[PDB]
Design a binder for this molecule. Structure first.
Ligand SMILES: Cc1ccc(-c2csc(CNC(=O)[C@H]3CCCN(C(=O)COCCF)C3)n2)cn1
Lengths: 229, 216, 222, 195, 227, 211, 206, 211, 229
């Protein structure tokens, strides 16, 4: 009588828990990603006494992830993803391809929607990475274990406006700096602000592998550049 | 028999976590202030109860201390668990557990109770203050299992006003004692027998005489 | 619901969870499979947002093992999990039997797995329907369709997913038994395009032969 | 008693093994088919030891690798394949171990032609020329003397003929039938050398 | 709201699920058991669900000197029958003697009671009458609630009120009745509930007479004697 | 601690056209001492099938009790008595179930099948078995099997007499058990002879030497 | 005798602001057949932590994989490099978790403790993680006696990177030339706070 | 025990002896060593009689279930793989099985040699048992693929004879089955080798044959 | 719950399962001294199916056949369990299992969801299991309630009532095997709506002479149609 039946089908072939988790993520802060020739980009918008990346996390030397949704579930899944990457390296003596890690983490996501009586993870990921077989890859993963591959996408609040801006501006032959400027422009557009503030920005990029996590001053420099244009 | 009692609401919220947050917000005030050379955690508490037996501030390890706002029993359980995890890290690596890693492990343990079946979330919020080779850290752990990195914060009743007070009196380059005075002022705004303070040397909890010496 | 029964009998005798898994299958994209003398053609619908979604990431036309291929309609994550289980069973058979898994054996294994998930406590039914094409031990080609309930049946030409009834009715009037590869592919395409918007980006068609499964280059689709 | 030979060049890799299946003091067969295990993707696992252990370990490895290559829809790298094989051999080293000697050969675009020598203890290393079995004691030196990194495949096969001749003349088991895998120019060839 | 779970009590201090399991016993076919100083005779009505049907088995042999009749759900009856048969055989294997009848009945009652205390389980929906000869003709009745009793005569199933009344009228004869008259008494009790060789089952057990079903010709002549 | 002792004693089986004879001694002994002068080795399984085993007595008794338990359970479950062949496969499986800690008991399963022909299955400890027209297990088996081969087969005699009757077979079995008692220290005391034919099982006793 | 199957030897030494880790390059079989000569026994955990594993080859590889797994997990979770002393403690605990069925490996840990001040850190181990932390040199492998003689007679305190390279290479080569089952090439790594020098010595290959 | 099988123009010839012995004592000379797995596949028994019998009947059970499930006849390769995989799960427990699975499937006539060690050697001429060496020698000296059914039967009979003649553990009766496209036939149900010695080697029968 | 009694003393779940067996194609089973014959209709859903891939008549063993009604996915699981158990009996005892024993095994499996002493619900299947054992030919009926009833002649499926009525009308003990076939197909013709044809029905027979499961081909069905009134 106290059981909620989290792993049951709704009358429409829909899972109510998965839909509500999707809603919760849609109410999360916006995270974006796009592919350049130089590498992958992930942008994200974060009281004055807060000291501290809370949207972008490193999974492996060649994989990193932007988060949307519940932060604690995101931390659990990030830890488990790091575990999978390291176990792949342990088993095969080679780095794990990005798609394989995405499939493993999404399987863990989905088993919570098929097995047991627990709730799903209320988190969605933008997994960016580089491997030799498939070059640079960006993946979107939703709470139900479905995933998709993208050249540029957005998650979180107002993802439609960011998606429209990305589609209108994202080219194939854009360099790292142009990609970063586009990322800042999308972050500003989705906030409905003419200028993006340099305290609500989380930018990082992965290139061939090395990852840069931009400090506030480098963000300020990128803001100056974006403002000149 | 094992099924989640914490479930997504139709709007995407975890109402049990929101209710635990309400409970913590209706709890006694605690706060922390990270100084340039140290970090302090302070808290506020009938002629019969022994004071020494109900200290909210506790010691996780020689350089790590913890305070809470919420349910005392949950705090006792989580304190024993945090001590266990610190000792496990010490056995593994031969050094004191780093503050951030302890915060992550306890955050994972707290999040587990928001998803596993047949358990309610922890009805407490934690402030963990510690020193490691990478400086002084002051972290807050929520009932949800998320951990924030702070320079200063308050986690109990009327904590909006206390947060505003700390904001209007916080400077990074502050001695330990300037921070201790600011903390006492903040607690007196929320409100020597009513004050418990711990400071980071190995983590230390101020004696009643010392606290009164600060109240002058 | 660790061990709570999810699929139960309704007062009328129905297993509502299976009808809901059927609804999940109906929500999915259309796929079509057509059998010939010694080869098959599988054409599935694809829908991606142009210029932003990588079109190579999603593969609903799945190779299972050396000789057997699969297509599905329904929930994608459930489909991936069931496909991985099927691949594991194909290799387990080829290890214990020393012979590759025949199409009928694989289809029966998928059907029994779906039935099991429909008949165990603490598990949700798979909301996916599959078309599995392959070769039997006698080297004969066969196409099987498995449903969420766990029922399976062999077909000459079958369509699954959204608007499957219309594609079935079309294929009934058009499937002229043995057909050449080119026009068999054309039939597999003009049947699926009766429901999906006419565009080379709204379909992927592959062909299974005794040698291997080959995806058709987009020039021919154009 | 299962002689295995492996040779690696800049543009080829050749595996070789006698084709005897033995049972006690009798040859069950003079054309074995349980030592070589071709793995899709220009990979090959040449196992020596006991027929039961060879079959079990080789087929376990082969089906796991094919399962990997089907689930991921990609070819496993030869180095990943070799280290997966060594890992699996080491896992069972202390629990019902397979007493099998292994040569792993392959070709990749990432590391070129690749040869790996692994013993029943699962001591594995990449080599340019390796041997397994008692016959090793009579062929390794030959491979050392006549090898250079720029050998053509035909010169490698002549060196293999030298090895087979020494195995016929000096090795106590007058082994005369051999099977060779030749991976080069993207193609994998099977050859049978008698005497 | 109190009949929903197996482990709940009503305000009246009643278990409604167990009482429903017992109500499942009223719709079984009538069976009757009676005893004299040496024998127990069990007679039951076989259910017939169509003309082309073969009559349902009504009595079962548990051991050389132990048999049973059932009323209620048949699958639960088969489970209990297998339990009892394996118990008697395990006793005869471990030791070299027949099982004490009270012990077997008490173990069956334990099996009944166990199911009543857990939510995941439901009570056995069948009532069993056990007829045996362990130094004496003995009739036991088990119930879903885990309680069992010992009877001089017993009947249960559909319309056992007529069989009851007949047995209560004739109880004082059974002790001093002979085997043939005891059989005829049980058959007349069974007839009150309404017999042919097909729709009636009849077995006897007693002193130096292992559990044995009455043959077809014997049943025919006995039914003629009833007429 | 070695968990196996051999209690001695012999069982001899012999089949005819429609009858089977199983004669076993009853002495129970340990090393050079006698536990007792009467411990039956032959058990009745059904009215047309018996089993007689030699080896370690406790194993034999447990095996026989388990066979009887399983046969009665089979009767109660499938509502018919098993044939001797069904019992034979059942006992083979029961024996092989302990393949790695085997019963120290060699067995002879004698009976009359549905077609009223004498059937004799001989078993070793781990389950291997075969049908036979004459068998012998126990200490005296190596002494007695040639006698049975010389009388029932006559492979090495040109002039052969084949017409045998039940009385002749019973007297021959008595002579064979007498010889076993004469030459085997572990064979002696009273012997029980079971004769199975259409009418069922008949048990007779014969006294043998007591030394 | 298990260690005689593959042979091998590892040698760590320290100087002034520099440290050195050297190993032999042989992989043998059945104690006398040299099957490889490129089998390096030195593995890099991070810029400031190196390990040298000697003993059974399979155990060396398994332990290296386990150590890499643990170190990569630690570093990613902390966003910082593992401290050398913490790595040594972790290696000891990993070794002792298998006390009764151990990895037949005799590792040495070499590197720099960071305080910036780069203090050389060395420590030897047995197969069950018995600490042998030392400030001058550490030895493991079958050539342990010869190596102890070399580092006893020839070790000089506070040598620059060139002096340390010369001393360690001479010690290793002289010890190896008296060992049947170890040799066939020598690898030497000299770490300083800014750069690492890797050299392959010209040694006997007999 | 001496079992052999060889593939020839008209199918497969399977031949066996029938002796089971316990050390130096011949316990039986009427053992059936050619076990029917299914209607088309035959197996032989060499080594542990209990192990071979139990595991070949178990393989028959698995095969019957498989055929019922998949509405198809299993191949010799698949059955041999199943048997080898099952026998490998018991590696180290002392199972002693030498079996030759020979049959006809959709891929033709097949013959596999499987022993308890896990072997699965495929071939067209095999022999198992203490007399396997003599059988191999005789078969190799005169094996031809285009032998007629009669010629193949004679060759198999002579090889079995010679093995029994030189080998202590082989003898009894020679049984020869012929596997063809439609099952198998008992060409020689059983022939005592006593006659075969005085047919092949000492036909004049006027003095002892000298080896 | 699944294990809940009703106030009348009947389990709700098996009661609901009773409505499921009423669906599906109709089968008829007739037992005569010479053997047992099971004949089933096939309501072919479309012309694109391979008619013989859908099977209503299966062989639990060489001497046992079964006609299936209700949820076919559940029925296949039941028949597979029956096959495994019958082969296990054959291996342990080296004889063909009695038909009633097989039906009782099927029944004990069918009610395994109760957990009195693992499936989660009742099977919702009706089995018409015929065979020939030492007792001769026999025919049994099993339903989700777990009660198994021996029948001289019986019918199952959508037109169960009509087929049963006809079989009662036209069945007598003294019947030849050919008369059994003729009667089975007469009832089948009268019940099905699709006109009877050589491709519309399955006929399987287990005869006392050989006790072997024989599935009819097109020639035999055409013969019986040629003999029909
Ligand atoms: C395949 C097969 C063939 C024969 C037998 C079999 C079992 S018995 C028998 C005939 N008799 C003997 O072979 C005796 C020979 C001496 C050793 N024997 C003992 O009984 C001594 O052990 C005392 C306690 F067990 C048996 N043939 C079983 N399977």
């Amino acid at each position: 009588r106290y059981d909620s039946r989290t792993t049951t089908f709704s009358p429409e072939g829909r899972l109510y828990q998965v839909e509500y988790a999707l809603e919760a993520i849609n109410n999360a802060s916006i995270t974006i990603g796009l592919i350049t020739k130089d590498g992958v980009i992930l942008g994200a918008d974060k009281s004055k006494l807060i000291d501290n990346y809370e949207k972008i996390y490193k999974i492996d030397k060649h994989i990193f992830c932007g988060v949307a949704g519940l932060n604690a579930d995101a931390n659990i899944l990030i830890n488990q993803s790091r575990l999978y990457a390291q176990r792949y390296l342990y088993n095969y003596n080679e780095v794990q391809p990005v798609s394989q890690l995405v499939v493993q983490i999404c399987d863990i996501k989905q088993s919570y929607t098929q097995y047991g009586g627990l709730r799903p993870y209320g988190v969605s990921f933008l997994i960016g990475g580089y491997d030799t077989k498939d070059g640079y890859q960006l993946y979107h993963t939703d709470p139900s274990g479905n995933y998709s591959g993208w050249f540029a996408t957005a998650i979180g609040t107002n993802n439609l406006t960011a998606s429209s801006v990305l589609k209108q501006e994202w080219k194939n032959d854009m360099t790292l700096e142009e990609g970063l400027l586009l990322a800042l422009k999308t972050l500003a557009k989705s906030t409905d602000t003419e200028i993006p503030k340099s305290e609500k920005i989380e930018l990082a990029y992965l290139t061939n592998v090395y990852q840069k996590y931009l400090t506030e001053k480098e963000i300020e420099e990128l803001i100056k550049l974006y403002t000149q244009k | 028999y094992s099924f989640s009692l914490t479930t997504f609401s139709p709007t995407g919220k975890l109402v049990q976590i929101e209710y635990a947050l309400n409970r913590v917000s209706s709890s006694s005030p605690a706060l922390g202030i990270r100084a340039k050379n140290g970090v302090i955690i302070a808290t506020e508490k009938n002629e019969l109860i022994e004071e020494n037996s109900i200290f909210k501030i506790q010691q996780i390890s020689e350089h790590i201390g913890i305070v809470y706002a919420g349910m005392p029993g949950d705090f006792r359980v989580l304190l024993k668990r945090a001590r266990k995890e610190a000792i496990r890290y010490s056995l593994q690596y031969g050094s004191e557990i780093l503050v951030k890693e302890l915060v992550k492990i306890i955050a994972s343990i707290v999040q587990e109770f928001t998803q596993t079946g047949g358990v309610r979330p922890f009805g407490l919020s934690l402030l963990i203050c510690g020193v490691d080779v990478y400086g002084y850290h002051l972290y807050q752990i929520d009932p949800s299992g998320c951990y924030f990195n702070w320079m200063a914060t308050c986690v109990g009743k009327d904590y909006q006003n206390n947060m505003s007070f700390l904001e209007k009196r916080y400077n990074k380059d502050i001695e330990i004692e300037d921070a201790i005075h600011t903390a006492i002022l903040t607690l007196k705004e929320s409100y020597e027998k009513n004050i418990e303070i711990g400071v980071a040397k190995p983590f230390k909890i101020l004696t009643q005489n010392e606290i009164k010496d600060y109240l002058i | 619901s660790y061990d709570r029964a999810i699929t139960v009998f309704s007062p009328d005798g129905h297993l509502l969870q299976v009808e809901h898994a059927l609804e999940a299958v109906k929500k999915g994209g259309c796929a079509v499979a057509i059998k010939s003398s010694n080869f098959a053609v599988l054409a599935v619908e694809k829908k991606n947002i142009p210029k932003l979604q990588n079109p190579k990431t999603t593969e609903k036309l799945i190779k299972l093992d050396e000789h057997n291929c699969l297509a599905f309609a329904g929930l994608n994550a459930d489909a991936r999990v069931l496909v991985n289980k099927t691949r594991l069973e194909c290799q387990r058979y080829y290890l214990n039997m020393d012979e590759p898994a025949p199409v009928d054996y694989i289809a029966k294994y998928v059907a029994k797995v779906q039935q099991k998930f429909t008949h165990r406590g603490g598990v949700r039914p798979f909301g996916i329907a599959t078309l599995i094409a392959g070769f039997k031990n006698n080297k004969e080609i066969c196409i099987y369709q498995t449903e969420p309930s766990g029922i399976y049946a062999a077909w000459k030409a079958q369509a699954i997913g959204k608007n499957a009834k219309i594609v079935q009715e079309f294929l009934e009037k058009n499937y002229q038994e043995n057909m050449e590869q080119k026009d068999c592919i054309f039939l597999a395409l003009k049947a699926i395009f009766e429901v999906v918007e006419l565009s080379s980006k709204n379909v992927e068609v592959a062909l299974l032969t005794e040698k291997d499964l080959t995806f058709i280059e987009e020039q021919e689709i154009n | 008693m299962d002689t295995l030979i492996g040779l690696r060049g800049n543009n080829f890799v050749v595996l070789a093994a006698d084709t005897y299946s033995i049972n006690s003091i009798i040859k069950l067969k003079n054309d074995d088919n349980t030592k070589f295990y071709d793995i899709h993707g220009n990979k090959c696992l040449l196992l020596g030891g006991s027929i039961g252990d060879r079959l079990q370990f080789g087929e376990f490895i082969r089906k796991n690798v094919h399962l990997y290559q089907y689930q991921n829809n990609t070819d496993m790298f030869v180095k990943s394949f070799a280290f997966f094989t060594r890992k699996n051999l080491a896992y069972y080293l202390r629990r019902n171990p397979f007493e099998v000697n292994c040569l792993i050969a392959g070709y990749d675009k990432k590391d070129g032609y690749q040869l790996y020598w692994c013993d029943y203890l699962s001591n594995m290393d990449s080599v340019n020329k390796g041997a397994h079995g008692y016959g090793a004691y009579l062929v390794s030196a030959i491979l050392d003397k006549y090898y250079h990194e720029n050998l053509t495949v035909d010169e490698a096969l002549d060196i293999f003929k030298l090895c087979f001749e020494e195995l016929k003349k000096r090795f106590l088991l007058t082994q005369i039938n051999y099977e060779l895998r030749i991976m080069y120019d993207n193609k994998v060839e099977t050859q049978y050398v008698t005497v | 709201l109190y009949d929903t779970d197996n482990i709940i009590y009503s305000p009246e201090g009643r278990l409604y699920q167990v009482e429903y399991a017992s109500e499942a016993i009223k719709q079984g076919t009538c069976a009757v058991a009676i005893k004299s100083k040496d024998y127990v005779v069990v007679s039951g009505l076989k259910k017939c669900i169509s003309k082309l049907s073969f009559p349902q088995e009504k009595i079962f042999k548990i051991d050389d000197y132990i048999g049973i009749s059932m009323s209620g759900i048949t699958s639960d009856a088969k489970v209990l029958t297998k339990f009892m048969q394996n118990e008697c055989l395990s006793h005869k294997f471990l030791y070299n003697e027949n099982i004490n009848i009270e012990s077997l009945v008490r173990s069956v009652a334990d099996k009944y009671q166990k199911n009543t205390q857990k939510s995941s389980k439901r009570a056995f929906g069948v009532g069993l009458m056990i007829a045996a000869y362990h130094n004496e003709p003995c009739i036991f009745e088990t119930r879903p609630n885990g309680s069992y009793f010992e009877y001089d005569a017993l009947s249960f199933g559909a319309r056992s009120h007529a069989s009851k009344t007949y047995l209560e009228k004739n109880l004082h004869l059974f002790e001093e009745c002979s085997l043939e008259e005891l059989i005829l008494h049980c058959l007349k009790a069974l007839k009150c509930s309404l017999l042919t060789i097909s729709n009636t089952a009849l077995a006897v057990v007693g002193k130096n007479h292992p559990w044995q079903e009455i043959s077809s010709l014997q049943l025919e002549e006995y039914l003629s004697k009833v007429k | 601690w070695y968990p196996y002792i051999d209690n001695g004693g012999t069982v001899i089986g012999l089949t005819g056209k429609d009858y089977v004879i199983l004669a076993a001694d009853t002495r129970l002994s340990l090393s050079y001492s006698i536990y007792t002068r009467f411990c039956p080795k032959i058990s009745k399984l059904t009215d047309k099938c018996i089993i007689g085993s030699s080896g370690m007595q406790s194993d034999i008794k447990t095996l026989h009790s388990l066979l009887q338990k399983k046969i009665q359970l089979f009767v109660l479950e499938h509502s018919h008595y098993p044939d001797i062949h069904v019992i034979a496969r059942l006992l083979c499986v029961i024996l092989y179930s302990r393949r790695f800690f085997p019963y120290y008991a060699f067995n002879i399963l004698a009976g009359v099948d549905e077609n009223n022909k004498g059937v004799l299955y001989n078993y070793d400890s781990v389950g291997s078995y075969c049908e036979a027209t004459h068998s012998c297990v126990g200490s005296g088996s190596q002494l007695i099997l040639p006698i049975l081969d010389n009388r029932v087969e006559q492979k090495n005699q040109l002039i052969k007499n084949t017409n045998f009757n039940l009385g002749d077979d019973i007297n021959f079995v008595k002579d064979a058990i007498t010889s076993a008692t004469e030459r085997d220290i572990y064979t002696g005391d009273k012997t029980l002879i079971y004769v199975i034919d259409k009418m069922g099982i008949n048990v007779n006793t014969l006294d043998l030497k007591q030394d | 005798s298990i260690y005689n199957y593959n042979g091998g030897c590892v040698l760590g030494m320290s100087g002034s602001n520099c440290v050195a880790i050297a190993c032999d390059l042989r992989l043998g079989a059945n104690t006398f057949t040299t099957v490889s000569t490129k089998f390096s026994k030195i593995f890099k955990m991070n810029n400031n932590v190196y390990v040298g594993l000697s003993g059974l080859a399979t155990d060396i590889q398994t332990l290296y994989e386990i150590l890499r797994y643990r170190v990569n997990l630690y570093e990613v979770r902390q966003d910082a490099e593992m401290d050398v002393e913490c790595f040594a403690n972790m290696l000891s605990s990993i070794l002792y978790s298998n006390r009764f069925s151990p990895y037949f490996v005799n590792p040495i840990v070499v590197g720099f403790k960071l305080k910036v001040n780069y203090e050389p850190y060395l420590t030897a181990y047995d197969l069950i993680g018995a600490k042998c932390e030392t400030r001058d040199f550490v030895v493991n492998g079958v050539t342990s006696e010869q190596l102890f003689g070399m580092c006893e007679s020839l070790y000089v305190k506070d040598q620059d990177e060139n002096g340390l390279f010369e001393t360690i290479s001479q010690c290793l080569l002289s010890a190896l030339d008296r060992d049947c089952i170890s040799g066939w090439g020598a690898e030497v790594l000299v770490l300083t706070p800014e750069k690492i020098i890797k050299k392959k010595l010209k040694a006997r290959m007999d | 025990t001496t079992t052999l099988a060889f593939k020839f123009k008209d199918g497969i010839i399977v031949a066996v002896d029938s002796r089971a012995s316990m050390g130096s004592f011949i316990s039986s000379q009427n053992v059936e060593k050619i076990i029917e797995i299914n209607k088309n596949i035959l197996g032989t028994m060499a080594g542990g009689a209990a192990d071979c019998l139990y595991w070949e009947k178990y393989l028959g059970k698995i095969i019957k279930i498989y055929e019922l499930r998949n509405n198809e006849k299993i191949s010799v390769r698949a059955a041999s793989t199943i048997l080898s995989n099952i026998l490998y799960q018991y590696k180290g427990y002392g199972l002693c099985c030498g079996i030759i699975l020979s049959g006809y499937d959709h891929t033709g006539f097949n013959m596999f040699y499987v022993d308890d060690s896990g072997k699965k050697v495929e071939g067209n001429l095999f022999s198992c048992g203490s007399g396997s060496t003599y059988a191999y020698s005789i078969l190799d000296s005169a094996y031809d693929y285009n032998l007629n059914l009669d010629q193949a039967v004679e060759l198999a009979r002579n090889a079995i004879y010679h093995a029994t003649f030189r080998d202590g553990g082989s003898g009894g009766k020679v049984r020869v089955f012929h596997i063809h496209k439609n099952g198998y036939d008992k060409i020689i149900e059983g022939e005592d080798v006593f006659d075969l010695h005085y047919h092949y080697t000492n036909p004049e029968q006027k003095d002892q044959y000298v080896m | 719950g699944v294990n809940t009694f009703s106030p009348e003393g009947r389990l709700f779940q098996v009661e609901y399962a009773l409505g499921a067996i009423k669906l599906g194609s109709t089968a008829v089973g007739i037992c005569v001294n010479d053997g047992v014959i099971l004949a089933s209709e096939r309501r072919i859903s479309s012309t694109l199916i391979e008619k013989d891939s859908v099977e209503k008549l299966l062989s639990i063993d060489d001497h046992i056949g079964c006609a299936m009604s209700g949820l076919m996915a559940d029925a296949r699981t039941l028949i597979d369990y029956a096959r495994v158990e019958c082969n296990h009996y054959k291996f342990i005892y080296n004889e063909n299992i009695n038909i009633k024993s097989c039906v009782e095994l099927i029944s004990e499996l069918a009610l395994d969801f109760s957990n009195l002493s693992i499936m989660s619900r009742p099977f919702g299947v009706a089995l018409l299991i015929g065979g020939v054992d030492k007792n001769g030919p026999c025919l049994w009926y099993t339903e989700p309630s777990g009660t198994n009833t021996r029948f001289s002649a019986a019918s199952i499926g959508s037109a169960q009532e009509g087929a049963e009525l006809l079989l009662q009308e036209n069945y007598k003990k003294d019947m030849t095997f050919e008369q059994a076939e003729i009667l089975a197909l007469t009832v089948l013709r009268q019940v099905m709506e699709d006109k009877l044809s050589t491709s519309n029905v399955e006929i399987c027979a287990i005869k006392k002479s050989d006790q072997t499961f024989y599935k009819y081909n097109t020639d035999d069905i055409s013969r019986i149609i040629d003999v029909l009134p």
